[PDB]
Amino acid sequence: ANEATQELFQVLDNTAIILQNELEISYLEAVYETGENLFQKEVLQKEEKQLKLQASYESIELENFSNEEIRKGLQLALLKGMKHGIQVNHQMTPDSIGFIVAYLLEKVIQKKKNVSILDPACGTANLLTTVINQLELKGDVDVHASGVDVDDLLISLALVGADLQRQKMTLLHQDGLANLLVDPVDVVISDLPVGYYPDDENAKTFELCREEGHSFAHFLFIEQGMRYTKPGGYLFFLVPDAMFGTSDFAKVDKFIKKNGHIEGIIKLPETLFKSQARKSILILEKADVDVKPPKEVLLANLSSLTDPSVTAPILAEIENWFK
Ligand SMILES: C[S@@+](CC[C@H](N)C(=O)[O-])C[C@H]1O[C@@H](n2cnc3c(N)ncnc32)[C@H](O)[C@@H]1O
Ligand SMILES: [Cl-]
């Protein structure tokens, strides 16, 4: 599409701008509200224009749009809704990055016909649904995906996006660092929250707990993720590249080595971020009886997404890395 995704976004935008004004809610909260209307084929908040909304919703038939066209349409609305006032930790992962994650999963899953995935801090699930739609694109791989988020609005947006994209996935509204009723997955992916974890009692259940004060949410997510990965499975975390140079990272490094290994660290282009400090993709493998670390960790500086002088030698290496 784009043709189709713009059509959908125009319906979402116009109707959310109405609901934003009538209900006096944020554009982002209006995107959720308009999306349930569209999905369920009702104007859900009638006792609170109604003709105008209905006409806009009936102007499209969603069955005629692909999952990716529906996702890309929501992505435009989410992006609009997160332009100001949203903290970095609540920012959705754009597919400029998600496609890169989907590509990397493609290398590790190889000729598996079933892949299970967990994002334990999933937000809007844009990353997760970008990954799902890419892997299933060929018609051979069945993805079984689970996402967890603690936030009401973001998990609601994950849930309606799943509904609108016609996904069969599991989305949990809870603390992703508490116990998860999720079976161990082939792959963990997450764009990690960075800062303090406020639940100091739950933190105690983790080896990466800090003795004094709040623990780091970003460290505990690495440990939780490894906890819910199958032996020999992989983990892909988006993290600030500055994490690696802190003295505290030595502790996470030591932890990882007791449980697996680092496969690679791929720095992402600056222009993918607002002015967000530059993130990197941390690639981990969980230990097993027939898994060894690479001879050398892949360290790649993907300073451009578009210039092949930069991308070609990096992608050529990644093409063979996991074989
Ligand atoms: C950068 S956002 C993730 C963006 C997401 N990948 C997307 O596509 O929309 C990080 C997420 O971590 C979540 N989070 C923070 N603490 C959490 C916790 N204890 N359990 C589950 N989610 C948590 C936030 O609500 C936030 O959505
Ligand atoms: Cl479909």
CATH number for the domain harbouring residue 210 = 3.40.50.150
Closest to 30 in 3D by CA, of 153, 181, 204: 153
The two tokens of residue 186 are: 């082939």
| Residue that is written with structure tokens 């990055």 in the block | 97
Q: For residues 48 and 157, state if they share a domain.
A: no
Q: Which CATH number is 11's domain given? A: 1.10.150.470
Q: For residues 197 and 65, state if they share a domain.
A: no
Q: For residues 55 and 178, state if they share a domain.
A: no
Boundary residue ending a domain (81, 105, 135): 81
Q: What domain range includes position 290? A: 83-323
Q: For residues 95 and 68, state if they share a domain.
A: no
Q: For residues 214 and 309, state if they share a domain.
A: yes
- Cα of 262 vs centre of ligand 1, distance in Å, is 23
Structural determination approach = X-ray
Boundary residue ending a domain (66, 81, 96): 81
Coil, strand or helix at 170: strand
Ligand 1 pocket residue status of 175, Cβ below 6 Å: yes
Q: For residues 180 and 321, state if they share a domain.
A: yes
Q: For residues 194 and 261, state if they share a domain.
A: yes
Q: For residues 147 and 267, state if they share a domain.
A: yes
From CA 8, how far away is CA 3, in angstroms rounded?
9
The answer to whether 185 and 117 are in contact (CB under 8 A) is yes
The answer to whether 98 and 126 are in contact (CB under 8 A) is yes
- Cα of 260 vs centre of ligand 1, distance in Å, is 24
From CA 173, how far away is CA 123, in angstroms rounded?
10
Q: For residues 131 and 172, state if they share a domain.
A: yes
Q: For residues 22 and 156, state if they share a domain.
A: no
Angle made by CA atoms 62, 100, 28, in degrees to the nearest 5: 45
Ligand 1 pocket residue status of 127, Cβ below 6 Å: yes
Ligand 1 pocket residue status of 171, Cβ below 6 Å: no
Ligand 1 pocket residue status of 238, Cβ below 6 Å: no
Task: Count other Cβ atoms within 10 Å, centred on residue 94.
Answer: 16
CA distances from 244 to 97, 195, 219 (A): 20, 15, 12
- Cα of 197 vs centre of ligand 2, distance in Å, is 38
The answer to whether 232 and 286 are in contact (CB under 8 A) is yes
CA distances from 216 to 208, 258, 282 (A): 8, 19, 17
Ligand 1 pocket residue status of 92, Cβ below 6 Å: yes
**Can you list the positions of beta strands (E) in the chain?**
114-119, 142-149, 170-173, 185-191, 196-197, 215-216, 229-240, 260-267, 279-286, 298-301
Structural domain total, the chain: 2
- Ligand of minimum distance to the alpha carbon of 191: 1
Q: For residues 138 and 185, state if they share a domain.
A: yes
Boundary residue ending a domain (81, 106, 121): 81
Ligand 1 pocket residue status of 136, Cβ below 6 Å: no
H/E stretch holding 255: helix 249-257
The answer to whether 29 and 153 are in contact (CB under 8 A) is yes
Ligand 1 pocket residue status of 174, Cβ below 6 Å: no
Q: Which residues pair with 191 in a beta bridge?
A: 238
| Residue that is written with structure tokens 């199958």 in the block | 230
Q: For residues 23 and 94, state if they share a domain.
A: no
Q: Which residues surround ligand 2, an ion (CB under 5 A)?
A: 166
Ligand 1 pocket residue status of 150, Cβ below 6 Å: yes
Q: Whose CA is nearest to atom 2 of ligand 1?
A: 90
